[PDB]
Amino acid sequence: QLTPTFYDNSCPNVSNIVRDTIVNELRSDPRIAASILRLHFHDCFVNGCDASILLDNTTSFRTEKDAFGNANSARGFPVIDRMKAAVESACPRTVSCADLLTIAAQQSVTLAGGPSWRVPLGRRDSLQAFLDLANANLPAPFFTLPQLKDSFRNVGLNRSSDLVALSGGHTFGKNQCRFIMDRLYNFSNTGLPDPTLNTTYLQTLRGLCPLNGNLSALVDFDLRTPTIFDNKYYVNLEEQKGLIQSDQELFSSPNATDTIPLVRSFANSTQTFFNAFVEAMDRMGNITPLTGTQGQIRLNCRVVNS
Ligand code: HEM
Numbered sequence: 001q002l003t004p005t006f007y008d009n010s011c012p013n014v015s016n017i018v019r020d021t022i023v024n025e026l027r028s029d030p031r032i033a034a035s036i037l038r039l040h041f042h043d044c045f046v047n048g049c050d051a052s053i054l055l056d057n058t059t060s061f062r063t064e065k066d067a068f069g070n071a072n073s074a075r076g077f078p079v080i081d082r083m084k085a086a087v088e089s090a091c092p093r094t095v096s097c098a099d100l101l102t103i104a105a106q107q108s109v110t111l112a113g114g115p116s117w118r119v120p121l122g123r124r125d126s127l128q129a130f131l132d133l134a135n136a137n138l139p140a141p142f143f144t145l146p147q148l149k150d151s152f153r154n155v156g157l158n159r160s161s162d163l164v165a166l167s168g169g170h171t172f173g174k175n176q177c178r179f180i181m182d183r184l185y186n187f188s189n190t191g192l193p194d195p196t197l198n199t200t201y202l203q204t205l206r207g208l209c210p211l212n213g214n215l216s217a218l219v220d221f222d223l224r225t226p227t228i229f230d231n232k233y234y235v236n237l238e239e240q241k242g243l244i245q246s247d248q249e250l251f252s253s254p255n256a257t258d259t260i261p262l263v264r265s266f267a268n269s270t271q272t273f274f275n276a277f278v279e280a281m282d283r284m285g286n287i288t289p290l291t292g293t294q295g296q297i298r299l300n301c302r303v304v305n306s
């Protein structure tokens with residue numbers, strides 16, 4: 001069983017060391033908090049939160065960093081290396097990379113203005129990486145609501161609240177033009193934009209992402225508060241201003257009978273959203289963890305101990 005007090009005797013200063021690292025990095029890269037939360041998400045959706053995503057290539061297994069959902073997208077790995085080294089100095093061979101990334105995600109959310117809570121701990125690190133599994137398990141922005149629900153259920157998150165609350169991670173961070181080009185100019189081979197995208201916002205996005213333009217250009221997920229972790233993401237959905245297809249479907253899909261009330265509830269109350277987010281975050285953080293003597297306490301998050 002994972003417990004929030006796991007390091008209270010062996011490394012009481014772990015959370016503060018992680019926080020300090022992120023605070024320092026945010027000065028030069030205001031996107032790092034968002035990037036770190038996403039790393040935890042992509043770690044947990046592939047064989048559980050076991051830091052498998054942090055492993056680099058070996059001749060026996062490929063890195064998850066080359067998965068369609070991570071390649072030229074996932075970022076912040078050097079920052080994780082930095083905090084890991086600092087924690088290793090303070091508490092040698094004690095904190096797993098899996099737990100470190102979990103704490104980093106929570107601290108990132110709090111630093112961005114979100115809720116503050118102590119995440120359950122005790123996870124251990126994987127002995128391998130899973131590229132094929134990452135390609136199969138990571139959801140895509142073009143997924144329909146049924147597909148999004150399928151993706152979450154596949155890893156153990158059955159609740160629509162899990163899906164709606166965790167999607168709130170898009171209250172900050174960036175998204176490449178490539179992922180919305182269809183919504184802007186030719187959605188589902190109709191030769192027309194996605195009808196569920198507010199037409200005024202459609203114009204703004206087309207200006208940022210012109211046809212045949214730079215597909216790697218970055219746009220903000222939340223037009224209201226781009227870097228602040230709050231419930232504005234849901235207010236956007238209510239106005240048909242969700243950035244990617246998967247965002248807007250939570251409110252506009254024909255299969256959204258169960259998600260619409262959740263979107264409204266979170267848009268109506270920060271407290272309601274924050275409570276649901278913490279609850280969902282801990283549930284995601286509880287996906288098939290290695291515990292006890294299973295796996296290792298990786299010294300270098302990029303490679304298995306030898
Ligand atoms: C429901 C399915 C989801 C889909 C299809 C999805 C899709 C995406 C896509 C397309 C990007 C843009 C990547 C890029 O342009 O490089 C992204 C970024 C991001 N996602 Fe999601 N996501 C999902 C769920 C989540 C969840 C559960 C969290 C966290 C709890 C999350 C947190 C983030 C954050 C914070 C960013 C910004 C990262 C950065 O700016 O570096 N996403 N996501």
Ligand SMILES: [Ca+2]
Pocket residue numbers: 042043044045046047048049050051052053
């Ligand atoms: Ca993993």
Ligand SMILES: [Ca+2]
Pocket residue numbers: 171172222224225226227228229230231232233
């Ligand atoms: Ca926001």
